[PDB]
Each structure stands twice: as C-alpha cells, then as structure tokens.
Design a binder for these strands. Structure first.
Ligand SMILES: C[S@@+](CC[C@H](N)C(=O)[O-])C[C@H]1O[C@@H](n2cnc3c(N)ncnc32)[C@H](O)[C@@H]1O
Ligand SMILES: Nc1ncnc2c1ncn2[C@@H]1O[C@H](CSCC[C@H](N)C(=O)O)[C@@H](O)[C@H]1O
Lengths: 260, 259
RNA sequence: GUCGCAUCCGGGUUGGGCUGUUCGCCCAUUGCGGC
C-alpha cells in the first residue's frame, strides 16, 4: 500500500503514537530509524507495520518478515516522524511485556536506579552508558516513558535489549531489599567522593530527578551517599553524565583499579 | 511604561536577538532564566536591559544594577523567549570579546580541545562537564557560537565563566605546542584504555564532534585512548565522553593511579 | 495588551512544571489571523 497525502487517516494514527497516552491506548509504539528498527527486531519485538520512505533501500523491505509494508511520501513521512529530518525506515511494534519476576542477578551485579527522571534524552543517554559499562539492571522508577521517541534515539536502540524495567518506587525499594543490594545514593552533597566507594561487590547506584534530585527517604536508605566533585560554577552535573561517571568508576574498579 | 503588545517596536528588536547575525551586529545577546541571568552577572558580563515578566519576584528587579528594566506582558515575553513556556527573568547582555592571547596556564593544566563543529545542545552539555571537572581551558573551532540559547541553557549558564576560546586550528596547535602539553586523542579505536593514560602532569584531551577527529591530530597525539564499550553501542554521547575523560584526569590528580 | 474570525458550550477554546532548548521537554486536564 502506497500513501501520499499527509492527511491520510493512517498517517494521523501513526503520528498519534508519539503521545504516551496513544501508546497506552493502542498497545503499540513507533520505532524510528534503520538502526533502531534493527535493534527492536533483533531483541524479539513484534513488528506490525513497516514504514518505508522514498530514499529507503531494497534491503529495508526484507526486514518486514510478514508485517504490513507501507510506502510513504516525503510529506507523509514528515508527519509521522519525531525528527526535524525524518528517517527513511520506521516500525510500528507491539509494546513489550517485561517483568522483574524473570530476572536473576549474579554475585556482584552493577545496577542503576533512576528515580523520577523527566527528560527522555537523559533516560536514553543513561541507557547508552549502561550499555557501554555492561550494567546488569536498570530500574526506572516513575519517570518519563521508556518507549518515548527520544529514549529510543538517544539510546541508539539500546533500550530494546538492555535489562531495563519500569517499576513503581515502592517496587524498586522492595526489589532492592529482596536482592540484598547495597544502595549508593549519588547526590551533589554526598559525604563521600564517588572514587572512595568500593563497587567491586554488588552495588545499586541511585540517581534522582533533574529538578529536585533524590528524595530524602532514598538518601537515608542508602548505605553511603557519594558525590562527584564540582570545581566550577555549575552546582550539579547532568543526571546522565552522573550515571556514566558512576558506571565507569565501577567498571574501572572491576577492571583492576583500586578505590581512592 | 509596561510593554504589553507583542508588536511593540522594542519587542521586535529584542526578538531579533534570536539570530546570531543580529547578535553580532548589535553586540548583544539574550540570557533567559533567573539561574542563567544570575550566572552571567556573577561571571562579570554587562547587563544592558533586564526583561521582567508578570510573575517576576521583587528581588529580580534588584538584579538590574542600573540597566534599563522593562516590564513585559506574557504575550510580549512569548515573542522574545526561545521557549514554549517563557522564563519571567531575561537579560540583554553585551557580547563579551575574549582572546586567547592573554591566557597563561599553570604547570599541570587540564585542557579540552573540541575539533569540528558540534551541535549547540551537545556543546552546552560538554561545557557543563568541563566546568564541573574544572577544565583550565577549552579550545573550540573559530566559528563556534558560545552565546546561542542552547549553549546557555544546556551549560546551566556555566559557559559564562568557563575559559572557552573559539580559535583557528593552527592557533590551537600552536598554543598547545608552546605549552609542551601532552595531547591525548579520544577515539573508539584508541590503543589504550582512558584509565591507562597518565594525566597527573597535564593533559590536553582531543575530542571530535558527535564526526570524528582529523587524522593529523590523532597521529600527533602522544596517546590515543578509548572508553570501553561492553555492549552493542559503539559510542557514547560527546558530553558523556568529555566528562569521563576530564573526571578521570581529576581522579588521578586527586591521588588516583593510572590503571 | 487588544480586535476580528472560526469553532465549541451565552459562556470555553486551558492550567502548571523543567539542572539538555529546540520541527524544546514534562505533567494535569478539558483554534486561525490582525493591530
Ligand atoms: C558520538 S562519538 C562519534 C564517534 C566519532 N565519529 C569517532 O569515531 O571518533 C563523538 C566523539 O566522542 C568520542 N567518543 C565516543 N565514544 C568514545 C569511546 N568509547 N572511546 C573514545 N572516544 C569516544 C570520540 O572522540 C568522538 O570524537
Ligand atoms: N555532583 C554530583 N554528585 C552526585 N550526584 C550528582 C551530581 N550532579 C548530579 N547528580 C545526580 O543527578 C541528580 C539530579 S541533580 C539534582 C539537583 C539538586 N539541586 C540537588 O542538589 O540535589 C541528582 O539527584 C544526582 O543523582
């Protein structure tokens, strides 16, 4: 089926998926970009509709594997895309079902706990860093939706394969207690420099919201509160930069380095 | 005195500052956000006009220091702002003009050399990381605009006091040579892990745009270092890379040993 | 600020928030111009 008019009803339906409410109502979501579509397919997500733009290449069509295939003009593509410059390959996938029930951790896991994050770019960047550092688990507690377009783009598709689970704040606390994982709260006023923590054992790093930071209750639960030094005018670092810094310090230590 | 119409001639001139062309012509630029205005002031920049919206606080007016204060309606504010939901505190500052010529670094400086043209939002975030880690100097391409709205917003205002200088490549190479600063190229294919470099005596990190480094710079570097990537992702965001590198140097200057 | 015109029930065509701001972002809800 070929579609030209940006006013085609399917195009309005497709463009609607950029909204979290439509994703919840339909159970489906949009994945934009060849790499991102590849990663969703490779992660086992169920493709319902492949969207091909005018400058798509022959191999793109072979990705559909039985899903409906729609050709879109540059005009209709522009409406469906979340990007100033539209990608040429997109996929409508069924939202995945994932629960922490099936998750088992090894002896010394590296875990990230994200509490209240609001900016989808920050979440995507954290997921990219978690991929780089080999994080064993990412718990997203009450933040922006994991399948927001910018999470997919900023994660370069890593959101689909990463062990990342949206959880309620209370379930995060429960799961952390159940797993007996030591909690390390990252907070700018933390009493200990982050380099001075030992992360060779199992560890869960707690990161707070971009505006208000970690709730006092969560800082209290942690065994230790760590800080990343601020030597200039900024009072705080970006949440994703902080997560990366913590993950790589732990990786440094797990790669042979000694705590400070 | 209150300015209520978006069509007021003064609103027209203030909104024109959204264009770099106009900022260069007038020598003025807009800083949106109490936090950012505060940081511009504390950085020593010259406030020419303070813009106050209907919800500004009494203390906001006292920031003016003899600048003209304009009270703007929400409708006039929306025309000047770069945001769907504007700030109540905006400031028209004089564009600072800084040259590298004066700069003298100490014995063990922490320097970041950004090669290529980076997008504004990424640049802003790179400069915040640099501010956080206490970079002694940041060198960017000659045509880099450091007073765009995204650089101010994504830097959390850190760009105003940060020693960042848009310079020609030869000027950059020359400055680094004349300080005898070890150059460390960050590249995914680096021969060494970034933790293995020794940054206790001074370092100039070379980082390309989110892009790649030019080959001449990679070869000239004393060491090419990589950040380990244990999954499918082949690269990290440039701002994250910048932070990882700068905080590693800080780690080593804080008693840490190279891996 | 204000004035048409739509549209919806005369009365509405919204509130808020934001340490990544850009075809900005988030959250409750329930339009298009002119001067
Ligand atoms: C998003 S990366 C793009 C990669 C870039 N084209 C290259 O090959 O260097 C942008 C910048 O981040 C740096 N970078 C990103 N990930 C890195 C890693 N794992 N190791 C070293 N440098 C990295 C590179 O120096 C690069 O200039
Ligand atoms: N310098 C730093 N040290 C440790 N954690 C930091 C940090 N900068 C940012 N973070 C992390 O990023 C999150 C958002 S920063 C929140 C800022 C708030 N003014 C505050 O002071 O808490 C924080 O909750 C923390 O998890």
């Amino acid at each position: 089926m070929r579609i030209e008019s940006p006013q085609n009803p399917r195009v309005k339906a497709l463009a609607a998926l950029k909204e979290r409410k439509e994703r919840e109502r339909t159970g489906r979501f949009l994945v934009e970009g060849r790499r991102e579509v590849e990663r969703a397919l490779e992660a086992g997500l169920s493709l319902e509709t492949l969207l091909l733009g005018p400058k798509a290449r022959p191999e793109d069509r072979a990705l559909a594997g039985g899903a409906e295939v729609l050709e879109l003009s540059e005009r209709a593509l522009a409406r469906v895309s979340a990007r100033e410059n539209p990608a040429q390959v997109l996929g409508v996938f069924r939202l995945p079902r994932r629960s922490l029930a099936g998750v088992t951790l090894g002896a010394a896991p590296l875990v990230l706990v994200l509490l209240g994050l609001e900016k989808p770019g920050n979440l995507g960047a954290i997921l990219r860093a978690a991929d780089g550092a080999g994080a064993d688990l990412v718990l997203v507690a009450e933040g922006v939706d994991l399948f927001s377009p910018q999470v997919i783009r900023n994660s370069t598709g890593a959101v689909f394969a990463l062990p990342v689970y949206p959880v309620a704040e209370e379930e995060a606390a429960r799961f952390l207690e159940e797993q007996n994982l030591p909690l390390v709260a990252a907070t700018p006023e933390g009493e200990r420099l982050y380099w001075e923590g030992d992360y060779r054992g199992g560890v869960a790093f707690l990161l707070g919201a971009e505006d208000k930071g970690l709730p006092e209750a969560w800082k209290r639960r942690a065994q230790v509160r760590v800080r990343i030094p601020m030597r200039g005018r900024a009072d705080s670092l970006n949440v994703a930069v902080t997560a990366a810094l913590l993950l790589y310090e732990a990786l440094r230590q797990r790669s042979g380095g000694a705590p400070l």
